[PDB]
Amino acid sequence: QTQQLHAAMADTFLEHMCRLDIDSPPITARNTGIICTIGPASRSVETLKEMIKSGMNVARLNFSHGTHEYHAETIKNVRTATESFASDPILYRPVAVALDTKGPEIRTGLIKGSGTAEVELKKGATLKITLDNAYMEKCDENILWLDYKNICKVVEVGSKIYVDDGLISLQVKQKGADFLVTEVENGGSLGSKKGVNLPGAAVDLPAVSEKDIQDLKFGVEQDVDMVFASFIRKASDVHEVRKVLGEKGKNIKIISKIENHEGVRRFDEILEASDGIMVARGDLGIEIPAEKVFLAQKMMIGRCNRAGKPVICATQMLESMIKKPRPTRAEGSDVANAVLDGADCIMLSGETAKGDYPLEAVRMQHLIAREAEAAIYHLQLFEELRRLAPITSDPTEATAVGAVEASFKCCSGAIIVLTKSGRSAHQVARYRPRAPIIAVTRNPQTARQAHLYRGIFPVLCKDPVQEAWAEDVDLRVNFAMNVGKARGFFKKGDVVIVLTGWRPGSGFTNTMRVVPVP
Amino acid sequence: QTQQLHAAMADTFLEHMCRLDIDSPPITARNTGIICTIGPASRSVETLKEMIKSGMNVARLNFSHGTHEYHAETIKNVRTATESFASDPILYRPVAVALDTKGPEIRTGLIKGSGTAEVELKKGATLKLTLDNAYMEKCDENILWLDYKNICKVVEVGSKIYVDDGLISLQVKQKGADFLVTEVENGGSLGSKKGVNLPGAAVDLPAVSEKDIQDLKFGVEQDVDMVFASFIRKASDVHEVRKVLGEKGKNIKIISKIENHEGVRRFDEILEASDGIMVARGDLGIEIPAEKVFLAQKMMIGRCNRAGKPVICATQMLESMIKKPRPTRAEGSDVANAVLDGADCIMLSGETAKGDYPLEAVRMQHLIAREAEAAIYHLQLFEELRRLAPITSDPTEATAVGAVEASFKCCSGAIIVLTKSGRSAHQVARYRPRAPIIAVTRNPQTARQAHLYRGIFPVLCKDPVQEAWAEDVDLRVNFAMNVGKARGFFKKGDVVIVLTGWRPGSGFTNTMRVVPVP
Amino acid sequence: QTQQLHAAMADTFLEHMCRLDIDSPPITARNTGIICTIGPASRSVETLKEMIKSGMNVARLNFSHGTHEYHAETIKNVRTATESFASDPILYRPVAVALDTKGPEIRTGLIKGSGTAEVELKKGATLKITLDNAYMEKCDENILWLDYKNICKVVEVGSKIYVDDGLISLQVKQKGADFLVTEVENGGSLGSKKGVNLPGAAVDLPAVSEKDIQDLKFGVEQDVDMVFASFIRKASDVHEVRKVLGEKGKNIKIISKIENHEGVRRFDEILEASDGIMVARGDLGIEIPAEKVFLAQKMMIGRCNRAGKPVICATQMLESMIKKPRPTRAEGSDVANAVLDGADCIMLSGETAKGDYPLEAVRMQHLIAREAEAAIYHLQLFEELRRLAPITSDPTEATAVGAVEASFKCCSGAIIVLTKSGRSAHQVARYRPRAPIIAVTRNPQTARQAHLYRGIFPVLCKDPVQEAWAEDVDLRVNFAMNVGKARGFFKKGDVVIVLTGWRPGSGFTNTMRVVPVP
């Protein structure tokens, strides 16, 4: 009568749905990664401490706005908040830092010399688009300046332009030398420095701008865990980010953000070149028709699950929580369905960066994820992952699917994995066990990067290397036993799966043990 | 390449997801029924004409507010708009009328003049919780009193009272090892006349209030097609609505709204007694934890699909469209997932009743539904429905499963069903074909009520009765051919499935024909 | 294009059949146990050496015929032949001895004083059955003596009497006391001391006769590995055999032979009480209609597979090989299908006991088994075994299933299992891996008894117990590596699965390692 175990036993997906039970409580463990955008609502050390307690795993830094100095301070505050819990290694939670690039963005300028001024646009009205820098800070109801000098080369008569998250829509009725005559289709309030989308158009802006270069270099300096690369259209875009990160940033994970039609069409080559994917639904839902976004989301999650690569579901997941302490029913549904789709990580943007309820948003993601994780039809999911995964000679892959199989068979409270680089734990995660994967590492970057994968609950061991290797291994296993008991994942007498290797070093995971919790 | 046919052919659900394609266009046909709440934004004949054109199948009248005179005028306008298209029988769309009851409620507020003296709160104040009808109608600082009597017997200390339907949370504590105490907590504001809830309880209130009685009788007078019965807790509640509708309203469909923990717990008995179910997520999401609503939604949709009974997914599906001309990404997701879950109908409330963009909301539900319908994994869905449906001697059930099988085998443009009561078309809908079900009927109520079922595209035959019954049957088949050709569901030479019976009258459907479009 | 790996990957059983390929050669390893009845054709040390080389695993002694002296000599010769290979422990094959009881048989007397003398019986002719021992030696064309005293009390008028594996049929025409008068329906060559079947009748003979007692006692003295108990009707029959074997024979395996209606009806209780089952098709096909035998065979194999208990398919598998050096196509089919059904063991009776081609019969069973083992649809088989096997907390179960899963993932050349009692190896066999299970034991009886399980290739470790337990464990693993390499199951660099425990003694298997062959 716990964790949807009645639904778990169903012979059909339909019967599985019929058995979902609001009176069947989830396990304590939450498997889905929580990524939070840090901004003025969430930047203080004190707020960041509560974020972490509420379930934040990754701190996203959005490089659309702010200076390096601002970002360096945020990173410092994230690290201050994280390390305030280092005193108890059993309770310490690793926290990753993600750099989200600006990328090839298009923005308007200032309404009447102000950052906050708005004008109204009425349905049918003429609005002139200018690239004359004179009108940079002088936008209004009749004249709009935007920052893309090549707009006129790529737009035509009858093109649609979207302003402010696609809320304002324009139709190019007349095209000039370095200006556009448009008609307001969908009107509304136009404010300053709003995002512009050209869904029809082949936009000519660089994959990695000069600003993106400086930002990525800063990320290397700041020891960031991962890059969320905005507007990835093709594999060569990924390779440009990778080259910029260089040898010095070779271990930083590249997550390609898919937010245009091109990114979708060339998904396979992008996935192959990336460490994972973000379904960047914001821009994606402006670039392609809104009614198609769920198709692209489920296609990308599916392909990532098949590749064993991390996938993030991002944007407007709990949007109304910017202003309200409770989400709408669509938002509750969206979070649950991203989990059920297969997403490794769910994300908050404005909900944590600037909203009135950042901690409530985090808490809500935690609550929903855990409910949805119990509602997964693992019986079908594990059968299909097995059938679709290549037979290989890799001992670690064999140990991992065997451990996952074993975890289903004895209903284990956890899979404990010792890992240096994270790979052994990643290989377990790919097979989607119900039980949490406690990944024990001494590598602090490994501990942080592990949040990219569903189910991986990283624990940073800070006990010194014990001389007898077998004792050092047992120490780390016992550490995980202590964490799992303290977090209420399991109790003494329960069975857990333990994954180790036959010698120290990396690349030797080959041992699976079914052990009672002491 | 069309209607996700590549995804359709996948051997696994995971590969099916991998194959979902934003460049695979849907068919013209949309199967999911659209229910729109009518109010000041959508009440005019002229707006209602556009609502119908945009895809409105059912007009919901919410009896929480408004007089019978107001409602009678709305119903008149709906009928005026609908009948403006009666001139072309080929293109005429039937439009149903649904009466949504107030049901047993509570009504918060004493100070109520357009903009009330705010709830806001007051994390411990004097309002105050009373075991009496004494100090109710009194205010001296900031208080707002309700309309319900006996709270006790079915009560426990420290419970919650969600004012303005979940916009405000409450702390209310009585017993309480010290006197007969009260308490107040976290607030916001108030519009005018709110509500109170009592979680996990068995609430005693009448199923059918005196007001409900008058509105149900009004519904019979106004020839409504269906009743959405509010706050159904048990089968005897449904039987009370049924008795109130009486012999005169015996053909009016009763849709039980599942609104609370009891309604979820007693779901099976409610379902058996009802004509269908509404997943009333608004109240449900206040009554149970918000993070559990997706569980109850998927449980009820699944059980309804299993029973072959209509299920409506309701509340906040495109909520942000009240103020904005585009939905959020969570809202697009929610609509698509309700359809993928298997909902027969999707609903709009404030989006069409009071919002700034009613037609855009309707259109968006139409676009999403049709995209999601192509993304259904029919291969698994039809296998599971067959495996789980009882073998019976019923010739109609066997014919209707034969018709769906045949429709999958020849990739038919439609399933044409002659039906008097709708039952034969309902029986086809239960098996979830990809192709639209063109239900040809002379019964105008049948034509309207058929919108409750996924894929039933009702057509009201006006043509006079031909002399030879076989010729009158062929006339109605040809009528459906003409509708399908006009709507672009199919062209001359395409194959369709045709269902008829061996003699006139209801209950004799036993003939399935695979026929070319003339 | 080996081991039917193309057929292995099919999404359906039908496609799997379509992909079966005569040009796809099997591995080396043969999993199905081969049981050979030893008799005059096969009992010389020299022939027995070749039977072992040809693949004989179990030596069956049929106690319907022959003296203790004769059987003691056979057993001595089996042991002489087996031990001639003891010189190389790497190549030594353990060989089990099985005692097959006479049980409650009914046999005829001697034809005209001789045990080889044969009357040809006429169709339609009269034959008198007597219990008068005057005629017990004087059996002829018109007088046949049976050894069943209670014949007349259990066989009514009109009853069918079958003689000589059912080939001769007689109808009870005249029912008396001490005798019966019958007409030969199916005439033929009647010989001496032929089996009699009374399919209608409730035969009241003891489960364990006085001869059976002398025989089982002899089995205990002779250190037999297993008893094939004839004509088991009920669980109390198994308990009887178990009590007869007593403390002294407590480790001898009881295999209940199912060969009448009652034993099929009471199958579940029999199975629960036994160590395994023989499908004793000979008698079964006379006792129940011949056309039902395949139903009872597939039912019993299925239930045994589900229980993880050994099942033997027995009787007439290659019958024509008694006289011919090649089998019929029905016989090739029968062998292949018993393996495909999921039989742990196949058996030879007259083919090895008295036939002209015993080594050819053994060889043929080995060739067909190995071809059929490759044709198994493991994808469905392993999925179904998993779904149907209880979730338990048993660490060994979890390890055994983990092992089989891992073995499928890395296409391992073997699963190596250290076992004292055999149980850990039995637990792996239950889940049906494609790869052989090399069971390393120091227990010689364990090594012999392990032939009862599909895929278990037992190896008897002779090496002395090392002082360091970890070194003793590694020594046994290495021994299995050497066996596998020598038998061509795998080569250096290939991967294998290794199962061990955390401490010495039975019941602690919890460790699964994926190890390269040194």
Ligand SMILES: O=P(O)(O)OC[C@H]1O[C@](O)(COP(=O)(O)O)[C@@H](O)[C@@H]1O
């Ligand atoms: O996942 P990775 O990076 O391959 O690391 C797993 C490694 O961790 C271990 O369990 C322990 O290694 P250390 O003692 O070096 O920390 C190895 O046996 C194994 O090869």
Ligand SMILES: O=P(O)(O)OC[C@H]1O[C@](O)(COP(=O)(O)O)[C@@H](O)[C@@H]1O
């Ligand atoms: O779906 P229902 O109400 O059972 O109606 C189906 C009936 O319609 C028919 O096809 C036509 O009947 P009518 O000619 O009386 O309309 C019958 O043969 C069949 O029994």
Ligand SMILES: O=P(O)(O)OC[C@H]1O[C@](O)(COP(=O)(O)O)[C@@H](O)[C@@H]1O
């Ligand atoms: O199959 P069984 O009878 O439980 O034996 C398996 C046992 O063999 C071992 O691997 C080795 O035990 P021994 O050293 O006592 O032979 C144990 O760790 C394990 O419990």
Ligand SMILES: [Mg+2]
């Ligand atoms: Mg973006």
Ligand SMILES: [Mg+2]
């Ligand atoms: Mg027999």
